[PDB]
């Protein structure tokens, strides 16, 4: 079984779930060369060692699986944040990582962000990291705590960047509407041409807001569901489960309460529906969640308590299976 961890990545093609990186206590990053594969249909794990341009071991990286080609951006290693971009073709032989020297201006070095996949584009939003090298489209807000306990200050951004896989070129779309505030540890989910984003941390709050960016027109929209909404949080997962539902699980509140609540956001109804499940005693923060082809949401890793208290952090290696559809 894979070692416990938080801040790893997990991506899938609906049947196989690829898990990489992250860190644990007793702190250290998990081995960079390992790639763990969970077969969603059988519940078994397989460890494969990779070669090539292996990325440094990181937490907070942002990854996707498109046609069984994995792509990884950003993260935080022993020497801080990065804006490097890697590809790992998993289709067919020893897997080889490829660090892509992209054209255009990359996003600033950062972690704890989100991404939407839409046709040939990978669209990245937000995150936490260094001051961008130059003034680009969007806003950056420093985290005042980063100036006293560090040699290099950091902050949040609301930046939207496209990595076009036709040419491996970075760009920023000109957006209309009001973008969500700069944030990190938010969660992104895509359904068709709508790139949803929920929650996240900004300044002294872990937020409860929900927006979508139209990935064809580049117009931002704020969603105002009526009635009861989930509590504000960061470090939660948001996973599309059908053409009309997003599944929300776990996270951490503004007042540092670990969460075990689950909800479905019904897009057509613009309404949140609380989801009953057998894991109320299993809150998770910084876990990952992948949808299977069987309607399930497979949650892995993450921490059961306040991982900000590193010596008491309860990092997990459990798989929690939510039967959503």
């Amino acid at each position: 079984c894979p070692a416990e961890r938080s801040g790893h990545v997990a991506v899938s093609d609906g049947r196989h779930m690829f898990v990489w990186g992250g860190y644990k206590s007793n702190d250290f990053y998990l081995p960079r060369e390992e790639l763990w594969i969970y077969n969603m249909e059988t519940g078994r794990w397989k460890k494969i060692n990779t070669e090539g341009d292996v990325p440094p071991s990181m937490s907070g990286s942002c990854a996707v699986c498109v046609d069984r080609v994995l792509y990884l951006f950003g993260g935080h290693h022993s020497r801080g944040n990065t804006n490097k971009f890697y590809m790992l073709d998993s289709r067919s032989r020893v897997l080889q990582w490829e660090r892509i020297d992209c054209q255009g201006i990359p996003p600033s070095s950062k972690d704890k962000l989100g991404v939407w996949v839409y046709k040939n584009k990978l669209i990245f939003f937000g995150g936490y990291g260094y001051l961008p090298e130059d003034k680009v489209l969007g806003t950056f807000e420093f985290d005042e705590t980063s100036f006293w306990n560090s040699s290099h200050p950091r902050g949040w951004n609301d930046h939207v960047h496209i990595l076009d896989t036709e040419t491996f070129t970075w760009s920023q779309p000109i957006t209309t509407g009001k973008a969500p505030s700069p944030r990190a540890a938010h969660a992104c989910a895509t359904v068709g041409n709508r790139g949803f984003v929920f929650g996240g941390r900004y300044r002294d709050a872990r937020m409860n807001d929900l927006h979508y960016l139209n990935l064809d027109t580049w117009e931002w929209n704020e969603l105002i569901p009526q009635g009861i909404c989930p509590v504000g949080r960061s470090w939660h997962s948001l996973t599309p489960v059908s053409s009309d539902h997003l599944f929300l699980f776990g996270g951490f509140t503004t007042d540092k309460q670990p969460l075990s609540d689950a909800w479905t956001y019904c897009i057509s109804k613009n309404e949140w529906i609380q989801f009953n499940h057998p894991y109320t005693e299993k809150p998770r923060l910084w876990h990952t969640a992948c949808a299977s082809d069987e309607g399930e949401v497979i949650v892995f890793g993450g921490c059961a308590n306040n991982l900000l208290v590193h010596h008491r952090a309860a990092h997990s290696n459990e798989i929690l299976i939510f039967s959503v559809q």
Binding site: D27, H76, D111, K112, T145, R154, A184, A185, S234, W286
Partner: peptide
């Protein structure tokens, strides 16, 4: 640690 900041 530096890895958990900003969350």
């Amino acid at each position: 640690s530096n890895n958990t900041s900003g969350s």
